[PDB]
């Protein structure tokens, strides 16, 4: 997901502005749905929500807009159990042998023959939660096992929390209402208000451990790869209690990152650290936020946002609809140079021409250069020490950058990666002169619709994740509900689309209408005032009761 | 009863629900969402009830791409009657009302549907829903940040046998 909130110091009108570009699946239980909810006098909110939920999850009201992105915080911890050396169904805590508990569930299964059989399955549980086996990594042997304690299992506050956000007046009120209830499960919140405040919060439900406990309570090898893993044989590694927290064992709101500014805040699923580089967010629990290199979407956004020029609605819209493959900025200049250095080397000819002709974009009309660039980048990522300038903590915005072609082991490896990528691309059944839009589509009944955008891992702000199905890449998730909100005097002005359309049912009039619009990148008014609603020539109305 | 809503749709089938209270508000949401997505919701509630293998057999997957029988074991474990009852008992009166209105508006669409916008008309899993079903969906989304990412691993967890 991306989010940018702009405030009075940087917007063209001196008021707030919010770009919400969440990235989520195009099917299933997290498929967004647009709606506007009004109890006249005390609620009026519009946005998009998830299946089954009678609250708005991302949206706007008369003076506020807010949105979310998945955070990098931990929302569970794994516990490594020391098993009783006499019995691998018991585990030790402070040297004392405890029995696992067993909970059986019974499932009915429909057979080949159409009849139902019953399958009983035993779930083993420790004081932390259920045990989990990941073969070759988290085993259950005679020495050790892993249990998993999820902090959102006790979060009974999540729906009240979004209903509360739906009733918020401005940024200050939003912050009070989120910090009071701590009901948000696993996303950042970013918002802007009419007064021109821009707010970022990493305010969610995060297992709390006091900082002095972390070094001995961590499992050093597992934390190395970012798994929140704790020592489950020591009772002092239990989540810490603090009576300021809304739920026993979670981090108090005062210890979670928040940034309130009048210029901008942004997040593209990196940690809180560089939400706005003029004010780094530092010093948090490693369960909360760490200073890691930022991915290419955030680098792209920060490259467009930094500086002193005003930001117009149009500028934020175009950061999405440009489909620029920002990862190309880091490697393609050096790559084309390798190409020039190897002319008439015939394995590389088609690849190098596609790359030089490429507009560096994931547009419907973008050339096959994008497909060569992707398969090359998949390989470049698995190479060691190939960056001309590697990640530099002191220049987190401009590094890594460039290919180390001045190191012969790299030039040989990079050339080989490009030959292997080019072979893969040529072995697939891509026509001559085919564009990105001829390949990446969303199926709608017996037809297909071309979809612009590409994987967020290549720095495309308009992130679109696809999978091979027959002769095409089929879109499965990415840009979903789009809302871009400003606050002119008459009432909030919101523009966007729901990329996959309102209805997942092929019979609906609203199965693909916004998808056709998304293909052509033509955003629309999101009508909110009764004046906007009444101006709509497709307006329909039904009143119902029972 | 005491459920009422006024629903306006603008271009692209975006509903605008007006009601005097949370029950009527939920009634309009549930009815408008069902018109567009009754089949999707029924499917996801089947998953969250752990009844995939019962309607579809062990050979298929949920929309999260888990096998039906491990997915069912996970959601039967997650959404046990005592967990749902404690979650319900912790809801505010307003949220309770939102949810009761939603189930009743969804069921009202289903009572009347003739297939105009509902491709799964007549399937045995397209059924009236209850507030507990919407708590099952809620819990399923809560744990997608956590134990839900380890659903297969939970199902696989079995103690060692005699091996070396
Ligand atoms: N956190 C979180 C989850 C989330 C989790 C639980 C519920 Cl009930 C509602 C939302 C989320 C998912 C998708 C989109 C958003 Cl905005 N938030």
């Amino acid at each position: 997901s991306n989010a940018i909130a702009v405030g009075s110091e940087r917007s063209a009108d001196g008021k707030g502005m919010l770009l919400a570009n969440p990235h989520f699946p195009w099917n299933g239980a997290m498929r967004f749905y647009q709606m506007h909810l009004t109890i006249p006098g005390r609620l009026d909110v519009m946005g998009a929500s998830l299946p089954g939920l009678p609250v708005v999850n991302i949206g706007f009201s008369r003076h506020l807009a807010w949105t979310h992105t998945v955070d990098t915080s931990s929302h569970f911890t794994l516990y490594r159990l020391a098993l009783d050396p006499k019995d691998p169904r018991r585990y030790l805590v402070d040297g004392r042998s405890l029995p696992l508990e067993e909970k059986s569930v019974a499932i009915e299964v429909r057979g080949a023959d159409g009849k139902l059989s019953r399958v009983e399955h035993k779930v083993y549980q420790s004081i932390y939660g259920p045990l989990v086996v990941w073969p070759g990594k988290l085993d259950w042997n005679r020495s050790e096992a892993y249990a998993l304690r999820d902090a959102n299992l006790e979060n009974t506050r999540v729906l009240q929390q979004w209903y509360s956000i739906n009733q918020a007046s401005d940024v200050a009120d939003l912050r009070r209402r989120v910090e009071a209830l701590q009901g948000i499960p696993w996303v950042n919140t970013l918002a802007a208000d009419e007064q021109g405040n821009a707010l970022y919060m990493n305010q969610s439900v995060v297992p709390y451990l006091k900082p002095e406990l972390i070094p001995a309570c961590a499992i050093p090898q597992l934390v190395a790869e970012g798994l929140p893993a704790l020592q489950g044989q020591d009772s002092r590694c239990a989540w810490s209690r603090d009576p300021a927290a809304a739920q026993a064992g979670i981090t108090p709101a005062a210890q979670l990152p928040v940034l309130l500014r009048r210029d901008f805040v942004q997040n593209s699923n990196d940690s809180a650290w560089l939400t706005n580089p003029a004010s780094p967010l530092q010093g948090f629990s490693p369960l909360v936020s760490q200073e890691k290199p930022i991915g290419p979407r955030a680098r792209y956004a920060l490259s467009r946002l930094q500086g002193k020029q005003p930001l117009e609605a149009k500028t934020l819209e175009e950061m999405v609809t440009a489909n620029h493959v920002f990862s190309a900025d880091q490697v393609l200049p050096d790559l084309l140079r390798l190409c020039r250095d190897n002319q008439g080397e015939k394995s590389l000819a088609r690849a190098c021409a596609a790359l030089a002709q490429w507009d560096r974009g994931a547009n419907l009309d973008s050339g096959s250069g994008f497909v060569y660039f992707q398969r090359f980048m998949q390989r470049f990522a698995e190479l060691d020490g190939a960056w001309k300038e590697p990640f530099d903590a002191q220049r987190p915005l401009d590094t890594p950058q460039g290919i180390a072609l001045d190191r012969p082991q790299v030039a040989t490896q990079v050339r080989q990666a490009l030959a292997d990528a080019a072979a893969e691309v040529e072995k697939s059944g891509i026509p001559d002169g085919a564009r990105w839009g001829d390949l990446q589509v969303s199926t709608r009944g017996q037809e297909r619709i071309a979809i612009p955008g590409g994987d967020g891992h290549f720095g495309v702000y308009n992130a679109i994740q696809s999978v091979r199905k027959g002769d095409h890449l089929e879109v499965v998730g990415g840009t979903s509900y789009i809302q871009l909100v400003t606050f002119p005097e008459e009432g909030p002005k919101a523009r966007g689309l729901l990329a996959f359309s309102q209805s997942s049912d092929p019979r609906s009039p609203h199965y693909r209408d916004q998808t056709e619009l998304f293909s052509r990148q033509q955003w629309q008014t999101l009508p909110f005032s009764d004046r906007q609603i009444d101006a709509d020539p497709q307006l329909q109305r039904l009143s119902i009761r029972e | 009863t005491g459920l009422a809503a006024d629903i306006r749709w603008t271009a692209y089938g975006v509903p605008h629900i007006r009601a005097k209270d949370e029950r009527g508000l939920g009634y309009g949401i549930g009815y408008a969402y069902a018109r567009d997505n009754a089949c999707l919701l029924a499917e996801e509630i089947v998953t969250a009830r752990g009844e995939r293998a019962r309607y579809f057999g062990s050979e298929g997957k949920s929309s999260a791409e888990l096998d039906n029988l491990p997915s069912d074991i996970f959601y039967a474990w997650l959404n046990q009657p005592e967990a749902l009852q404690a979650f319900w008992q912790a809801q505010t009166p307003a949220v309770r009302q939102l949810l009761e209105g939603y189930a009743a508006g969804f069921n009202r669409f289903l009572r009347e549907a003739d297939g105009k916008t509902t491709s799964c008309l007549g399937q045995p899993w397209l059924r009236a829903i209850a507030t507990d079903d919407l708590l099952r969906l809620t819990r399923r989304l809560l744990v997608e940040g956590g134990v839900g990412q380890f659903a297969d691993a939970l199902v696989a967890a079995a103690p060692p046998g005699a091996e070396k």
Side-chain angles (χ1 to χ4, degrees), chain A residues 33 36 38 42 110 125 133 142 150 156 163 502-505 507 530 536 540-546, chain B residues 3 5-9 11 15-17 19 22 27 36-37 53 77 91 108 111 115 119 142 147 153 161:
Chain A
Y33 179 74
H36 175 204
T38 303
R42 70 189 175 77
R110 190 144 169 310
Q125 306 173 172
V133 165
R142 294 192 163 267
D150 179 325
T156 58
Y163 195 43
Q502 280 287 77
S503 175
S504 62
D505 202 295
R507 288 170 181 202
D530 289 329
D536 189 326
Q540 295 180 28
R541 178 170 179 201
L542 173 76
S543 301
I544 46 167
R545 65 164 290 270
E546 65 190 59
Chain B
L3 296 146
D6 186 69
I7 303 164
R8 288 176 293 177
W9 283 273
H16 302 263
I17 297 111
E22 278 73 10
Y27 192 60
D36 297 317
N37 287 291
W77 167 83
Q91 296 315 291
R108 188 212 172 114
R111 278 194 305 277
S119 289
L142 277 173
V147 68

Side-chain angles (χ1 to χ4, degrees), chain A residues 149-313 315-336 338-345 347-381 383-387 389-393 395-408 410-426 428-431 433-434 436-461:
Chain A
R149 180 173 173 185
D150 179 325
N152 284 300
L153 279 173
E154 305 164 79
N155 177 7
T156 58
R157 302 170 309 288
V158 58
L159 302 179
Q160 180 196 352
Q161 176 74 90
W162 264 293
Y163 195 43
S164 181
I165 290 169
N166 294 178
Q167 285 171 79
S169 59
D170 54 11
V171 149
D173 187 42
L174 175 61
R175 173 182 193 175
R176 290 191 294 279
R177 275 167 186 276
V178 170
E179 288 179 358
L181 188 63
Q182 299 198 267
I184 289 177
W186 37 263
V187 294
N188 288 306
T189 303
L190 292 77
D193 63 17
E194 182 175 7
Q195 167 178 60
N197 296 282
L199 173 70
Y200 161 88
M201 296 187 289
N202 182 17
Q203 284 280 345
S204 59
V205 173
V206 182
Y208 182 38
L209 209 62
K210 288 159 180 195
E212 71 271 14
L213 293 174
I214 295 169
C217 278
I219 306 292
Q221 326 74 297
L222 293 176
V223 296
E225 348 158 339
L227 278 173
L230 301 171
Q231 309 265 359
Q233 77 294 21
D234 191 330
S235 65
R236 305 164 284 202
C237 297
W239 297 352
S240 294
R241 289 165 185 282
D242 176 311
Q247 174 182 317
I250 77 170
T251 307
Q255 299 188 39
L256 293 176
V258 171
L259 196 58
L260 167 65
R261 287 179 65 94
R262 282 190 170 277
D263 56 349
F264 73 82
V265 288
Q266 66 71 42
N267 177 270
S268 283
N269 301 123
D270 304 293
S271 68
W273 182 32
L274 297 177
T275 300
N276 175 327
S279 194
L281 288 163
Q282 299 193 126
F284 293 93
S285 169
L287 286 159
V288 175
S289 181
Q290 302 182 17
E291 312 176 15
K292 301 287 217 214
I294 51 173
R297 291 180 280 121
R299 262 183 84 174
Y300 166 78
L302 285 171
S303 80
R304 311 310 302 174
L305 299 161
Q306 292 204 306
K308 280 161 202 317
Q309 288 319 294
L311 293 161
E312 283 162 22
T315 314
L316 304 183
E317 174 176 327
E318 289 176 354
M319 285 175 66
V320 176
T321 56
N323 297 302
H324 183 58
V325 180
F326 187 68
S327 291
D329 285 34
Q330 286 91 66
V331 318
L332 188 71
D334 288 341
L335 186 58
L336 286 166
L338 183 148
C339 281
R340 285 185 302 268
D341 289 358
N342 279 269
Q343 197 160 10
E345 164 68 61
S347 58
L348 302 183
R350 276 170 73 205
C352 295
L355 293 163
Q357 295 168 345
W358 178 40
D359 70 351
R360 291 174 296 117
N363 309 294
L364 302 184
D365 279 341
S366 281
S368 74
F370 185 33
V371 179
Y372 290 104
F373 180 76
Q374 287 172 76
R375 300 295 159 251
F376 165 86
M377 279 306 287
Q378 287 164 347
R379 295 156 178 95
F380 184 78
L383 302 187
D384 306 289
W387 290 115
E389 300 160 292
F391 173 65
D392 176 9
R395 311 164 66 241
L397 302 222
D398 300 286
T399 61
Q401 173 65 32
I403 304 172
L405 296 174
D406 58 346
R407 288 210 275 276
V410 180
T412 314
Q413 296 181 3
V414 163
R415 187 182 26 206
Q416 185 51 45
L418 176 54
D420 293 347
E424 198 208 313
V425 175
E426 288 142 23
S428 73
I430 295 174
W436 175 234
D438 304 307
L439 181 49
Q440 177 173 261
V441 302
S442 188
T443 298
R444 293 287 183 279
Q446 35 174 24
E447 303 278 276
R448 285 163 219 209
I449 292 177
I451 303 302
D455 200 280
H457 295 94
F458 307 118
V460 197
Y461 212 55

